[PDB]
Design a protein around this ligand. Structure first.
Ligand code: CYC
Lengths: 50, 161
């Protein structure tokens, strides 16, 4: 509307699939689940206090 | 009574942790110094009576304490003084071999101040005698073995004072 130069508002799924799902650009939730990363309970029980 | 190895293991066990890299480095330091500790212990076991009699010849002889009225006067008191100095040199050798002064405050410095204060034994004169014993054995075994002997001799003098 006569104040701003344009900018890339929409991608195709091909272009977004190109840029985001590359391995360095990737997150780690994106497509299958990730399980929780707790420490082992025998290490937690073997400490020196609750 | 614990050496450097047993104290490292006791720290890692009171933590409940395994032996990490700092404990490995401490044990590597002890396993590098151990041969020097062994050779200094053999050299000190060679010359027990000579180091003791040179310590008395440096500090306690020809002073007032061997004269009448002194606490080192009689032959019984002289023999007990030689016995006490032999104890200090023997336990300093043990603490040098272990690399930990836990044997000194477990078995020398436990009731020693109260014993010497009940008997009337001068603590400053026996501290000077232990210092001369340290000086003689550091002249005997060299610079760094004399230093690692003198740290436990200074431990005995600090706990006695
Ligand atoms: C292994 C650890 C350990 C130590 C060190 C030890 C010391 C010790 N030293 C003693 C006496 C003594 N200690 C001394 C020593 C000294 N007086 C001096 O004037 C000098 C400054 C100094 C010698 C360098 C003397 C003279 C006595 C005899 C006191 C007496 O017979 O009245 C006694 C009185 C009992 C007895 O002679 O046999 C003990 C228990 N006991 C121990 O279990």
């Amino acid at each position: 509307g006569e104040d701003t130069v344009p900018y890339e508002r929409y991608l195709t799924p091909g272009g977004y699939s190109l840029r985001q799902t590359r391995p360095g650009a990737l997150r780690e939730d994106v497509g299958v689940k990730v399980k929780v990363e707790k420490t082992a309970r025998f290490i937690e029980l073997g400490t020196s206090s609750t | 009574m614990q050496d450097a190895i047993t104290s490292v293991i006791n720290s890692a066990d009171v933590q409940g942790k395994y032996l990490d890299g700092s404990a490995m480095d401490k044990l590597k330091a002890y396993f590098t110094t151990g041969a020097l500790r062994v050779r200094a212990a053999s050299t000190i076991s060679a010359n027990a009576a000579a180091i003791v009699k040179e310590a008395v010849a440096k500090s306690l002889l020809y002073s007032d304490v061997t004269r009448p009225g002194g606490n080192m006067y009689t032959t019984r008191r002289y023999a007990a003084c030689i016995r006490d100095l032999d104890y200090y040199l023997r336990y300093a050798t043990y603490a040098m071999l272990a690399g930990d002064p836990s044997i000194l405050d477990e078995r020398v410095l436990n009731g020693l101040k109260e014993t010497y204060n009940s008997l009337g034994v001068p603590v400053g004169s026996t501290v000077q005698a232990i210092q001369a014993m340290k000086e003689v054995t550091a002249g005997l075994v060299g610079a760094d073995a004399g230093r690692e002997m003198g740290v436990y001799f200074d431990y005995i003098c600090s706990g006695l004072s």
